[model samples]
Target: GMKLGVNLCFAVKRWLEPDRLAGLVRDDLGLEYVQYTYDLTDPWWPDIERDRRAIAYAKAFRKAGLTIESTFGGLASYTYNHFLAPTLELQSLGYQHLKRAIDMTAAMEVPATGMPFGSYSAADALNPARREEIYAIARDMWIELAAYAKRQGLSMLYVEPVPLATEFPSSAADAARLMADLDGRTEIPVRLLVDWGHALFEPLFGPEADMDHWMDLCQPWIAAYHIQQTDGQLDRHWSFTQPGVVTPQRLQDFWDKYALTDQTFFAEILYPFEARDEDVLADMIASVKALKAASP
Candidate 1:
């Protein structure tokens, strides 16, 4: 699903209100869809009252005429450490949580759900194999959830990858290995939510670590993707922050792999910071145009 929507992170942060942000995406940005995430103003908002209050927000966004394609699940502390909590109890807990998320996705009428592996957080700083074990647990849970998602008629599950982190799968190679491993078990349909910023961050393991190879290898498994770039070290989420950092050579290869179709989720801007700033929107529009018309 190549979605064209901004992650609600920026809009809600700017005091623009979720519904108003959807309007900006529709009337101002000229996009047809939007991706919703877990945050302060969402049903997944930690407070029960917050969750109850978010219903009107959802209705308001839907009224704005934007397609809601996906939602993100929140990760709790200690869940990231697969070492100590390595019990079926933990796996069951994870599944139940996902089921709740799926229910919300169903209510939102979105088609998919995703999360970058949480085990990579600063809390899990012990053991080289920690990430591996955590991923194995996650992979098993993904297989289990895929079955339930199928039951719920959901076709897409997005596994986000971040590099040089404690995550189980930071690069396409890691994703490929996980997919292959999952294939041998219960044939669950897993896909990549290839974040462009993260793609740029991916390290080179000889030639295979190159972006072109990663895209080609992961293409078959991708149900959707995230588009953004970063000139500096971390993901600033700045809107249309850069147009040519990825280089035309690399951009052309990407075009050959997948056209700008389906759902193109904009994960740019750390939100609030860039939402009300019209200057950022101008740059964002420019970047979108440059990307849409870039050549080989």
Candidate 2:
């Protein structure tokens, strides 16, 4: 059986507070594994309250018999180039805050911290000079961050490669390039976080490409998955069992072929934002059952 898990983005973003949410997932949903986005537990205070809250969330999950699979960092407002006006100082500040987040992850004993490189613009991607400039800055920052994470005894740093020209690691090729660049730079592991929703738009591989070839390219360093489905066009994070979207067969194929019993599969559904709590939980239960129907 697979060690199923979920990302706490919807729980943090839409549904419930982290403490109560952890309990619900453990007791009600009967899931013992979960991940969290930085949005869920981001605190920027230098006060005791900051440490208290982080410790509290960790204990809450622990009490619920839940193990955190990963935690994503890099909030929009915190990153200089992500969504805000880009600046040298602002970018530095962004990393400073992110560095602090890594510390929080360490304190909480979370294994990996995933960070998305802020989205870039098409115009920026088209310009070689500009693209290289941004790439160099991002690369160097990652090098520093990776080193810091290692020193903190962190296990992994998962970089979410968005499928947009405006984002770093825009394709499997770009993700490979990044892995190559940072391969031996860090003592700890740095891997690509393959979001199934974003992978639906691989321009180089074509939108309708199967995940086998992409997974082949990302071997060894592939960290985890933000599992969601789309209509082969939009990066819409529909339920995995959404009609005309990804099927359980495809998911099982990937799971078995990849030997992902040990890897994390975080259901990154977005419909829950507009869904009633019962409906969201029902869809999730249905999706999980379908996934297991194909499992051994």
Candidate 3:
């Protein structure tokens, strides 16, 4: 069976301690794998203290028989302003944070690390000159990072594509193009860290968003997913059982294409700060159980 996991976003959002986060995922949720984001209690940037805490965090997970498979880079406002935009200064900041994340992930022996990429403006997408410039910048930055990641002994760098007009590589074709560009430029493996809810949102506002087309184009490059359901109105990282949203049948096709080894399927959920820990855990357990049963 494919590996199933959850992102520690909710726990991080609640400002849970690292030990408490590990315990919640392993003891309460009954899961064995996890993904980390910048929001985790540890520092987001590279530091001796961050590394020390991260090494300890990895050890605790190891003691519990849990695997930390992925980590993310960026600040709390990452969703709005990320690594991909035209700001040279911001890119430098994003690069440092991501580089530190790669170092931290490697220190923990994690396999993959991910971050958002590309310009968010629809105008940038429409203007050929502007598009080319952004592409060049993104390509150069990622190529250098991919080399760094290889040196760190990481297997892959997952580049997550958001579906907003303000985000680049919004469609499967766009994502494939970015991967192809990197493939031609570097041997370092780069794959799409697909968030399925974003995939569903693209068709309504962007190009053709058929499931089979997306699966066919991106299957080979897909490394992991931020699995969540949505009502197709917003990028709601709702639970798997969210009504009138993605279903097992909707995901079965992609599941059939996923590589059965070393790949991760992360149940990425976002709950309000006011939500109780017990209720949140209950939702996660039930949602993940349904997803696990749905997997072949």
Give each model a TM-score.
Answer: 0.75, 0.87, 0.88
Candidate lDDT (C-alpha), each:
0.59, 0.70, 0.73
Off by over 4 Å in 3: 41-46, 73-77, 121-126, 202-207, 257-261
Whole-model lDDT for model 2 versus the true structure?
0.70
Candidate 1 C-alpha lDDT tens digits along 1-296: 23345665554445356667667777767776667766534333454555454555567678987777777632232234332235556645556656666666655556777766444445543555764666667777778777887677776776776664566566787778866776646434667777666666634343443566676677666666666655535654545545435543455456555664563645444544434567656765665555545454
Model 2 ranges with Cα > 4 A deviation: 13-19, 43-47, 74-80, 83-86, 202-208, 272-274
In the range 1-296, model 3's lDDT, one tens digit per residue, is 55668888867656356677788788777888788776763445447877787877788888888888878743473644445655667666666766777888888888888877745455665677876776677678888888898899998887887776656777788889988888857647888888878887854544454456667788788778777888777888898767746775566556666544656778788888788977887888788777766746
The C-alpha stretches of model 1 lying farther than 4 A from their native spots are 1-3, 15-18, 40-58, 73-97, 120-131, 184-188, 202-209, 241-244, 247-253, 257-267, 271-296
Better candidate by lDDT, 1 or 2: 2
> At residue 86, what lDDT does model 2 achieve?
44
| Clash pairs, model 2 backbone | 120-166
| Ordering by lDDT | 3, 2, 1
- 1-296: candidate 2 lDDT, tens digit per residue: 55567776556455445578777777656778788666666646663666566667778898878998777863443254542114556567657776877887887788788777665555665677777776777777878888898888788888887766666776777788989988988678788888777777645448535576568677777878877767767777776567645776667677877778577777776663466877777777676666556654
RMSD values, in order shown: 4.4, 2.8, 2.6
Query: What does candidate 3 score on TM?
Result: 0.88
